[PDB]
């Protein structure tokens, strides 16, 4: 996945 940080 890419950057999934909210």
């Amino acid at each position, epitope marked *: *996945a*890419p*950057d*999934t*940080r*909210p």
Partner: single-chain antibody
Amino acid sequence: QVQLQESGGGLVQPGGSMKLSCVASGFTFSNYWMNWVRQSPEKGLEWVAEIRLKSNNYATHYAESVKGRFTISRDDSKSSVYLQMNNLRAEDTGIYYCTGVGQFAYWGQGTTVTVSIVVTQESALTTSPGETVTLTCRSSTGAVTTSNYANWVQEKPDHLFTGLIGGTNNRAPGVPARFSGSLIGDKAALTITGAQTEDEAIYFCALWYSNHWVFGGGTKLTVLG
């Protein structure tokens, strides 16, 4: 608010070098990956490079078009991301943006550099205020799925980019509720439930393919009446 301020663009000869800078404020810069994306009349929006966190050893990845010539780096102590560009070519001409967060919420104003898989969207759609309009985003590899982390980004005049949706269905902070993202059939979709006059703009989708992004060609949305 969040600001991403770019600098460093200008005129450069083929074979030359240039370094772009982007300073971030208003969010915890060091917690997020950062990207460079460029825009040209010819090639549209093109993802150039990403840099991950300190806990990822600052891992990077590049578009094939720039690999071996461009270097992305970051200085978390200065909340800054950079792009070193070497061995410049005519095709590198364009407006360069730093962008990130969930996954393209925030965009800088752009800095202009002058050197001197297909994602398909509707070329245009026409709607009217109060209508429901759905923009779509197709992959040339097969279905768009959650694995493609579709993002939707709005371009308003003066090359003003704002991320609306990320991660398929996630509305970026403070984005109007009339915008929603989903998967419909084998495509990603942006739905505007009650279009507003000010929504007349170009909307780009971006899809993730394991380790890089590909942007669609954009949809020009006209909002008539």
